[PDB]
Amino acid sequence: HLPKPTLWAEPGSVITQGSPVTLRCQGGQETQEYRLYREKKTALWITRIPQELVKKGQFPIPSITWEHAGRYRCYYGSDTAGRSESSDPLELVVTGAYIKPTLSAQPSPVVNSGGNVILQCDSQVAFDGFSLCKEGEDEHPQCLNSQPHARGSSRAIFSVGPVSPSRRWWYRCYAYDSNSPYEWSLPSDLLELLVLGVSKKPSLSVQPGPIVAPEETLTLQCGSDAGYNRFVLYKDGERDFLQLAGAQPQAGLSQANFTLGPVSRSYGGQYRCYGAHNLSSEWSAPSDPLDILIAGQFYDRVSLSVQPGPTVASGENVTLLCQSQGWMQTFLLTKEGAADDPWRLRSTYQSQKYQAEFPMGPVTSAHAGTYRCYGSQSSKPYLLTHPSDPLELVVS
C-alpha cells in the first residue's frame, strides 16, 4: 500500500536524436529502491546504469537513439514490503528519423477568437502515423496523434479547438511508421495562428501603388490612430503571416512598413493588415483588403483615349475609353497619385474591338492628371496587361 511513484523526463518526452535526457522517478521521501522498465521490449540501457544513480531515481541517457524510444513505467519495492504499483506511463519519443512533413491551417492561419481551425499535416512519402504538437515558451510540448482519420496515408487532419487570445499558439507536426511509433520524423516548420479580436481596424496602403510590374519593388504600409505598436500582414492563400516592425505610437499614431521585391506574378493577391498593443495578443479586426495586381502579364496591349479631347475646361462632360483588340473580360482605370481603388468595368464588344467607357461627368481640377488603363481576364484574376500609354487631363 505505498504511494505510487511519479515518472517524468528532464528536459522532456519528445527529444531529437543525439540530445541528452534523464528519466526521473520519485516515490515518497525514501530511497535506496528504484526500478524502470520499457513496455513490450526490455530496454538493456537501464541495466548499465550505476546503482548509486538508480537509488536517486535517476536513469540518464547521454545520447538518445531509437533504441531508447518507447513507453516507460516505474516502480519501487522494499524488502519487508512488496513494492509500489507502477507509475503512469512516460512515452519517450526520438525525433529526426525522416524528411519533415508540411503543416498548414485550413482555410487560413487567421482565426477568430472562440473559433476552430483545421491543421493539415502533409508528407511526400506515405506514413501510417502523424502527431501534432502544441508549443509554448513557458510550456512543454503537448502532442496528440492520429492514425484514424489520417487519410491517404500521406496526410492527416486535426481540428484545433476553441482558440483564445489568452496564449501564443505554436504548432509542429510529425510523421512516423507504426512499426516504430516512438521514432518520429524531423519536425515540420512552426505554425503560428493569428487569433483575432474586434479592436479598431488599421489601414493598408501600398507605395508606389497596387498596380505593380515584374522586377519592381513595393512597400506595404499599416497604420492606426488606435495606438498599435505591432502590425501583421497576411495574403490570402499563404501558409504564414508577415510581422512588420512596428513604430512607437505618437497621438495613437503608428505606422509599420515592409519593402519587398523583385515583384513576380506570385505577388498578386488580396492582402489584409492587423494591429495589436504590446500587452494584448488579441489582434485587431482586419484592414479593408488590398488587391496587388501584376502588370504586363498578357500578349494583349490596351489603348486609352478621351472623346472630346485631352484639354477641357471645368464642368464639361468627359468620358475615358479603354480598349483592346484581344478579348478582355474587364478594363481597369487608374490615375497618377490616386489613393482610391482602380475603377473596374465589364468589357463591351464595339467597333470590332473590346472596350469599356468610364464616364467622369462634369470636370473639376481633381478630375485632372495622368490616367492609364489595364486589361483583365478572370481566369488570371490578380494579373493585368501592360498599361495603356499615359493620357493627361488638363482642366481650365
Binding site: 531509437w66 529526426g96 528519423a97 525522416y98 524528411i99 508528407s123 512519402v125 511508421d177 516504430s180
Partner: protein, 100 residues
C-alpha cells in the same frame, strides 16, 4: 546449440524482426522470407550486407522511388537500416541462445 527448435525459432523471429523494421515490408514484400535460412544462423551478421545490397538495388526500380527506405529517410543523419538489422539479429540470437 544448433537444433530444430532453435534453428526454427531463430528463422521466424528474424523474419518477424526484419518485417518490424519500418520500410522493409513495403519495399521487400513477400521476398523477405528468402533472406533468412539455416545458412544465416551460421553467419548471422551476413544479413546486414545482403538486405542492404537488395534495398539499394530495389530503390532503383521506378515503382519504389516514393518508398520510405528509398527517399523518406533524413539524409543528414547516418543510415539506421544497417544498425536495425544488426540489432534485430543480435536480439533474436540472445532470445534463442538463452534456451534455459
Amino acid at each position: 546449440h544448433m537444433n530444430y527448435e532453435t534453428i526454427n525459432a531463430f528463422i521466424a523471429k528474424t523474419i518477424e524482426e526484419l518485417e518490424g523494421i519500418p520500410g522493409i515490408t513495403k519495399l521487400f514484400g513477400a521476398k523477405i522470407s528468402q533472406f533468412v535460412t539455416p545458412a544465416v544462423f551460421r553467419k548471422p551478421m551476413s544479413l546486414v550486407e545482403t538486405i542492404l545490397s537488395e534495398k539499394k538495388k530495389l530503390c532503383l526500380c521506378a515503382a519504389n522511388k516514393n518508398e520510405l527506405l528509398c527517399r523518406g529517410m533524413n539524409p543528414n543523419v547516418p543510415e539506421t537500416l544497417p544498425k536495425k538489422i544488426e540489432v534485430a539479429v543480435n536480439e533474436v540470437l540472445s532470445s534463442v541462445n538463452d534456451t534455459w
